[PDB]
RNA sequence: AUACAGUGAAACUGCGAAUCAGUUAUCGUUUAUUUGAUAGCAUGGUAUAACUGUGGUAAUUCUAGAGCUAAUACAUGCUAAUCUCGACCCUUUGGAAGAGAUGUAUUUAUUAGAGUCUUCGGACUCUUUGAUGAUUCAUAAUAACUUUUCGAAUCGCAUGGCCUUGUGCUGGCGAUGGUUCAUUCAAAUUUCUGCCCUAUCAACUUUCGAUGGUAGGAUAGUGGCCUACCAUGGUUUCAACGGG
């Protein structure tokens, strides 16, 4: 796709030279916001836009990198992961079944599968409630 | 006298001591006297006077010079106080241009509402001179780059009229008609540099048409001749010499820009006068441009080599020998590539030209290039 | 939040606004002129705003023609015309060239008048031109 | 606007009234810098109370590292010198065995320079390079071989640099913080992670290594040549039991 | 009122501006000397 | 001390007026103050305070009237001048005719910001920039927009020098101000855990925002903090939701 909205989607200020000839018309902007990853081929030769993504959008990653299992993908560009971590209680002195909800903005770099494990880090706050961003599934 | 001027501006009984009114308007005094006298002339009526035409003429000259704000506003009030028929549709433009909120697009738009009447031309030229009188440090720059670019929305006759208006105070054709100029005034010499800056600004704003006015071009030549006159009339206390070096560099770079920008329907058949002035500029030291940033000397020589018409006034003097000498210096700078391109352009535009003088210049150029283009060791750009 | 601004076209009049921590912001209202820029070879000029044709979120602004960010324009073409025929010696892209004798150009606003108080246009050229002519076709 | 939760290396008792001196804004952080009031009143006892501390500051008398700075709560902290013309003294004030601020007594030719770990380096404006060290000495024009976590020798009379010091294996380092505070030595190995928790590791006579985060430590110098005379005879703080054992031996 | 002191202070402001510039743009050159030394080194 | 010179009431100006707990990031914000760097007209006008007076009013720290006069209060406003290439000389460590170059604040568009040869000593050319883990980072150039920002109309102590004794030109110490950057001190948000009892609380949130994505507005900014447009989500027997 190229549009889903009345407005236009475009990488801001990374434009081509609109006089001379190049076979891209927009230099798709490379970035990596850290964490030692190699840049993805979908970002080098991709087609989406995603201003909340950490590979073309202008948001940065650092801080709290955590993991979990994907259970919910039904929203728009944001998936909910399951940090299924066991807790401890001073009453029982045993272990118990616990998990919390963590939503994370999915990126269309690689596909959005229901069930995989992701490695997501703390970003500048993309929305009202979601705080992290997908850097790698 | 300041109390007398204030009392005569308070008690408004005009046409009772109006005997020396136009003589005082054509005479000189201080600025504290000039502000009160322009306030009195705006408080009067000027319909029937000793000479109402002379009063309007002094008002136009005051709104021209004006020191860019105050007498501009006072003379605009005087011009509205005169017979201002067909100007109530431009009184908003006059008040805006005299005011310090002179949005230049707004002034040229309110005049474009007052257009098809042509009764705003003298006021617009005086407003252009007021906006051109801005002086020094980046506010003057932000105003001048606005003014010289925004005055391009005007008539094709009125642009040459404003150029002649700049030409008027420092034309000096009666001074330079006999041999050259002999009187040196630094205050008028600075106005020559102001005319040079305004002409370069107008050329850079509109470098296709450029609007040639012949007396303005000859006055620019007279300013460059006054620069060479001061250089031969060295004033070695040398504030005047520094001013003359500031005038001649910008003057040569401006005179090269007009020819090299228009280059098709300008530079009329009287090119021998400009060739004589360039011969006077080269007779000091023809090879004084051996640097790579050789400004306007190599540009005029290369433009005369490029445009095939100018070879006649080129070969009038021996100037191709001068360009070949500056090219054939031993340790010549990176302008040697422009000199070789000049040889390429002057081979098929002088050796394919009229045989009497242009082929003679081409023969001299080929004789220079046979025994003077030996060290071809340009180890830089392979292009 | 604070009050809306909804700045209009014609008769420049700007509120003086001091905000949180210095940062003097220019709440411009009723913008009259605009600085626009050739996006492929870089020349900018102050240029007189005519109207706003497109709004990318609400056709209430296509009705009332309110100046904001990201609203496609048709503005003046005359100072770009004077430079285009006064320094070239040509006096003339092809679909940009088609917008010459129509008396209107096409561009977009990025600077917020309720925040910065400026007025910026970039002359759209290429796939921007293609998408925005398709947006003109989407309206019409 | 108040205090008494002061950093306990200030030798501050509890029954000295309630409030402690709040360090005003200056070169250093509050947690690792002592003010001139807690210096001149209850660190070397040249004064008695704040009134006469104000007297001996506005007597044009004190000169923290080249200049007067009449301010009681002035945070002249680590690696500075405090010269006084009367009492002949120069105090480079550094860390020590236990963690508090040891005074020195420094002569003039060692008192006419300090040194500084660089905190960051950039290019300031108009093409000019840009160096800032730990005390806010934003200094233009270094030598171009600039690293970060790196020691520059500040001339301290005119505020330029007089000498440059790199950092690698086999040249001294001195810790400012952590549990191992005020300790020297640099000879094990130069390990680096990413994301911190790395140190230039620390020697001992028994090869005892102390590894902290690299923001705390910085170079003094090299073997045989440190640029500061060191407190209490090069204090490495072996042991109280080893001290009593050496007491029983000799 | 124009005093002997006021134009003295104006003169001192002139001297301070010209002295700051005539130290700054020379310290630029003494930095460029070390940069040229390292450029001949590398 | 015939401008002023000591103290100096009054007044203006300047400055200052569920605690949640541990807990990371601010490459998402501003950063007053301190501290360190940092910017080539013998000096003009308001519009007034205290005060002098006229009163009202039971009265208030109530006041109106007119006469006054101050600025570091308000509002305008300025001086060629230096760095490159320097052919030639006369030897230079120069001085030179002149071919030249010229700040800052806001906004947008960019663009850059990636194996021989030997005087065995020496040379013979090799690559442009500051980094973090990471950038549209730091920084430099053009184009104009600026309801046009700043680039000192300020003060105290001495007041020394150059000699062409002008009444010249210079010159010290430091008080305030002021552009930008950094520091320091802060704020305002943000990542991870927790506390009162409950299934005689099992469903809770898209009521008139619920939860996302795209644009716009608000923002000091990341950000439904809101607007429209696209999607119909999200939470939960894990003790959620509600109540004590």
Curated annotation (Swiss-Prot), chain B:
Origin: domain of life: Eukaryota
Coiled coil region boundaries: none
Subcellular location(s) per record: Cytoplasm; Nucleus, Nucleolus
The HEAT repeat ranges on this chain: 77-114
Span of the signal peptide: none
Family assignment from sequence similarity: Belongs to the UTP20 family.
Function as written in the Swiss-Prot or TrEMBL entry: Involved in nucleolar processing of pre-18S ribosomal RNA and ribosome assembly.
Assembly information from the UniProt record: Interacts with snoRNA U3. Interacts with MPP10. Component of the ribosomal small subunit (SSU) processome composed of at least 40 protein subunits and snoRNA U3.
Protein name: U3 small nucleolar RNA-associated protein 20
The organism of origin for this protein: Saccharomyces cerevisiae (strain ATCC 204508 / S288c)
Portion of the full-length sequence here: 769 to 1151 of 2493
Curated annotation (Swiss-Prot), chain C:
UniProt-listed InterPro entries: Ribosomal_eS8, Ribosomal_eS8_CS, Ribosomal_protein_eS8_euk, Ribosomal_Se8/biogenesis_NSA2
Main location: cytoplasm
GO cellular component term of the entry, any: cytosol
Alphabetized GO MF terms: structural constituent of ribosome
Subunit structure of this chain's protein: Component of the small ribosomal subunit (SSU). Mature yeast ribosomes consist of a small (40S) and a large (60S) subunit. The 40S small subunit contains 1 molecule of ribosomal RNA (18S rRNA) and 33 different proteins (encoded by 57 genes). The large 60S subunit contains 3 rRNA molecules (25S, 5.8S and 5S rRNA) and 46 different proteins (encoded by 81 genes).
Protein family per UniProt: Belongs to the eukaryotic ribosomal protein eS8 family.
Job of this protein: Component of the ribosome, a large ribonucleoprotein complex responsible for the synthesis of proteins in the cell. The small ribosomal subunit (SSU) binds messenger RNAs (mRNAs) and translates the encoded message by selecting cognate aminoacyl-transfer RNA (tRNA) molecules. The large subunit (LSU) contains the ribosomal catalytic site termed the peptidyl transferase center (PTC), which catalyzes the formation of peptide bonds, thereby polymerizing the amino acids delivered by tRNAs into a polypeptide chain.
This protein's name: Small ribosomal subunit protein eS8A
Origin species: Saccharomyces cerevisiae (strain ATCC 204508 / S288c) (Baker's yeast)
Organism placement in taxonomy: Eukaryota, Fungi, Dikarya, Ascomycota, Saccharomycotina
Curated annotation (Swiss-Prot), chain D:
Cross-link type Glycyl lysine isopeptide (Lys-Gly) (interchain with G-Cter in ubiquitin), residue numbers: 54, 126, 153, 160, 166, 171, 203, 225
UniProt modified residues of type Phosphothreonine: 107
Subcellular location: Cytoplasm
Pfam family, one: Ribosomal_S4e
GO function terms (MF aspect): RNA binding; rRNA binding; structural constituent of ribosome
Gene3D superfamilies attached to this UniProt entry: 2.30.30.30, 2.40.50.740, RNA-binding S4 domain
UniProt keywords, alphabetically: Cytoplasm, Isopeptide bond, Phosphoprotein, Ribonucleoprotein, Ribosomal protein, RNA-binding, rRNA-binding, Ubl conjugation
Listed GO CC annotations: 90S preribosome; cytoplasm; cytosol; cytosolic small ribosomal subunit
Chief place where the protein resides: cytoplasm
GO BP annotation list: cytoplasmic translation; translation
Superkingdom as given in the UniProt entry: Eukaryota
InterPro entries, A to Z: KOW, Rib_uL2_dom2, Ribosomal_eS4, Ribosomal_eS4_C, Ribosomal_eS4_central_region, Ribosomal_eS4_central_sf, Ribosomal_eS4_KOW, Ribosomal_eS4_N
Phosphoserine, modified sites: 24, 239
The family this protein is said to belong to: Belongs to the eukaryotic ribosomal protein eS4 family.
Protein function: Component of the ribosome, a large ribonucleoprotein complex responsible for the synthesis of proteins in the cell. The small ribosomal subunit (SSU) binds messenger RNAs (mRNAs) and translates the encoded message by selecting cognate aminoacyl-transfer RNA (tRNA) molecules. The large subunit (LSU) contains the ribosomal catalytic site termed the peptidyl transferase center (PTC), which catalyzes the formation of peptide bonds, thereby polymerizing the amino acids delivered by tRNAs into a polypeptide chain.
Miscellaneous notes: Present with 573 molecules/cell in log phase SD medium.
Protein name in the entry: Small ribosomal subunit protein eS4A
Curated annotation (Swiss-Prot), chain E:
Taxonomic path: Eukaryota, Fungi, Dikarya, Ascomycota, Saccharomycotina
Miscellaneous information on this protein: Present with 66000 molecules/cell in log phase SD medium.
Ranges annotated as spanning the membrane: none
Function text: Component of the ribosome, a large ribonucleoprotein complex responsible for the synthesis of proteins in the cell. The small ribosomal subunit (SSU) binds messenger RNAs (mRNAs) and translates the encoded message by selecting cognate aminoacyl-transfer RNA (tRNA) molecules. The large subunit (LSU) contains the ribosomal catalytic site termed the peptidyl transferase center (PTC), which catalyzes the formation of peptide bonds, thereby polymerizing the amino acids delivered by tRNAs into a polypeptide chain.
Subcellular localization, as worded in the UniProt entry: Cytoplasm; Nucleus, Nucleolus
Superkingdom of source: Eukaryota
Stated family: Belongs to the eukaryotic ribosomal protein eS6 family.
Residues joined by cross-link Glycyl lysine isopeptide (Lys-Gly) (interchain with G-Cter in ubiquitin): 37
Segments forming a coiled coil: none
Gene that specifies this protein: RPS6A
Protein name: Small ribosomal subunit protein eS6A
């Amino acid at each position: 796709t190229v549009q889903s909205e009345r407005a236009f989607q475009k990488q801001p200020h990374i434009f081509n030279n609109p006089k001379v000839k190049t076979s891209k018309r927009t230099k798709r902007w490379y970035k990596n916001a850290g964490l030692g990853f190699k840049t993805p081929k979908t970002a080098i030769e991709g087609s989406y836009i995603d201003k909340k993504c950490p590979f073309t959008g202008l948001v940065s990653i650092r801080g709290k990198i955590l993991t979990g299992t994907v259970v919910s993908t039904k929203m728009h560009r944001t998936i909910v992961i399951r940090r299924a971590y066991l807790h401890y209680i001073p009453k029982y002195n045993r272990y118990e079944k616990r998990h919390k909800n963590v939503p994370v903005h999915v990126s269309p770099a690689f596909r959005v599968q229901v069930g995989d494990i992701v490695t997501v880090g703390q970003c500048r706050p993309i929305s009202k409630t979601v705080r992290f961003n997908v850097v790698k599934v | 006298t300041y109390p007398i001027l204030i009392r005569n501006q308070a008690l408004k009984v005009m046409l009772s001591i109006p005997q020396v009114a136009e003589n005082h308007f054509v005479d000189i005094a201080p600025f504290v006297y000039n502000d009160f006298k322009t306030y009195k002339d705006e408080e009067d009526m000027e319909n029937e006077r000793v000479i109402t035409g002379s009063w309007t003429e002094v008002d136009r000259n005051v709104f021209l010079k004006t020191l860019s704000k105050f007498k501009n506003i006072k003379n605009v009030y005087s011009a509205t106080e005169l017979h201002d028929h067909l100007m109530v549709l431009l009184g908003s433009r006059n008040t805006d241009v005299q005011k310090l909120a002179l949005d230049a697009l707004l002034a040229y738009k309110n005049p474009t509402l007052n257009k098809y009447r042509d009764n705003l031309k003298n006021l617009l030229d005086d407003t252009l001179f007021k906006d051109e009188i801005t002086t020094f440090l980046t506010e003057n720059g932000s105003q001048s780059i606005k003014a010289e670019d925004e005055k391009v929305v005007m008539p094709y006759v009125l642009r040459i009229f404003f150029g002649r208006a700049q030409v008027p105070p420092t034309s000096g054709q009666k001074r330079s008609r006999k041999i050259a100029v002999i009187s040196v005034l630094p205050n008028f010499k600075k106005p020559y540099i102001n005319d040079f800056l305004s002409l370069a600004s107008e050329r850079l704003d509109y470098n296709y048409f450029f609007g040639n006015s012949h007396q303005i071009n000859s006055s620019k030549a007279t300013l460059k001749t006054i620069r060479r006159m001061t250089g031969f009339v060295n004033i070695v206390n040398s504030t005047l010499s520094v001013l003359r070096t500031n005038f001649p560099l910008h003057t040569n770079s401006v005179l090269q820009p007009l020819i090299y920008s228009i280059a098709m329907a300008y530079y009329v058949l009287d090119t021998e006068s400009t060739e004589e002035v360039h011969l006077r500029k080269m007779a000091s030291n023809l090879r004084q441009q051996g640097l790579k940033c050789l400004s306007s000397v190599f540009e005029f020589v290369g433009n005369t080599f490029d445009w095939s018409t100018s070879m006649e006034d080129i070969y009038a003097v021996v100037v191709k020998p001068r360009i070949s000498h500056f090219s054939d210096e031993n340790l010549q700078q990176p302008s040697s590539l422009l000199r070789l391109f000049l040889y390429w352009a002057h081979n098929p535009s002088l050796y394919q030209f009229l045989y009497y003088d242009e082929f003679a210049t081409a023969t001299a150029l080929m004789d220079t290039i046979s025994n003077q283009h030996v060290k071809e060791a340009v180890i830089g750009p392979i292009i | 939040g604070r009050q809306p601004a909804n700045t209009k076209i014609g008769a420049k009049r700007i509120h003086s606004v001091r905000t949180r921590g210095g940062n003097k912001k220019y709440r411009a209202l009723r913008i009259e002129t605009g600085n626009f820029s050739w996006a492929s070879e870089g020349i900018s000029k102050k240029t007189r705003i005519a109207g706003v044709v497109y709004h990318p979120s609400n056709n209430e602004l296509v009705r009332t023609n309110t100046l904001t960010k990201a609203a496609i324009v048709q503005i003046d073409a005359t100072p770009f015309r004077q430079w285009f025929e006064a320094h070239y010696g040509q006096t003339l892209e092809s679909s940009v060239e088609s917008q010459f004798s129509a008396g209107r150009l096409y561009a977009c606003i990025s600077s917020r008048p309720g925040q910065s108080g400026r007025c910026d246009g970039y002359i759209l050229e290429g796939e921007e031109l293609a998408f925005y002519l398709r947006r003109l076709t989407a309206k019409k | 606007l108040k205090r008494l939760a002061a950093p306990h290396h200030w030798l501050l008792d509890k029954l000295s009234g309630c409030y402690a001196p709040r360090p005003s804004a200056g070169p250093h952080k509050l947690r690792e810098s002592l003010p001139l009031i807690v210096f001149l009143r209850n660190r070397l006892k040249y004064a008695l109370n704040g009134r006469e501390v104000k007297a001996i500051l506005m007597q044009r008398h004190v000169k923290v590292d080249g200049k007067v700075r009449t301010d009681t709560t002035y945070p002249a902290g680590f690696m500075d010198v405090i010269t006084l013309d009367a009492t002949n003294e120069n105090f480079r004030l550094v860390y020590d065995v236990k963690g508090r601020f040891a005074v020195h007594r420094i002569t003039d030719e060692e008192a006419s320079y300090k040194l500084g770990k660089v905190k960051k380096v950039q290019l300031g404006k108009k093409g000019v390079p840009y160096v800032v060290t730990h005390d806010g000495r934003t200094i233009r024009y270094p030598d171009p071989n600039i690293k970060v976590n790196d020691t520059v020798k500040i001339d301290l009379a005119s505020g330029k640099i007089t000498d440059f010091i790199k950092f690698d294996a086999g040249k001294l380092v001195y810790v400012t913080g952590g549990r191992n505070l005020g300790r020297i030595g640099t000879i094990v190995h130069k390990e680096r992670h990413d994301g911190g928790f790395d140190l230039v590791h620390i020697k001992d006579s028994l090869d005892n290594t102390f590894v902290t985060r690299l923001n705390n430590v910085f170079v003094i110098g090299e073997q045989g040549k440190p640029y500061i005379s060191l407190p209490k005879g090069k204090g490495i703080k072996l042991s109280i039991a080893e001290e009593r054992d050496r007491r029983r031996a000799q | 009122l124009v005093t002997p002191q006021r134009l003295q202070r104006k003169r001192h402001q002139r001297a301070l501006k010209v002295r700051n510039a005539q130290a700054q743009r020379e310290a630029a050159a003494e930095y460029a000397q070390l940069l040229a030394k390292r450029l001949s080194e590398r």
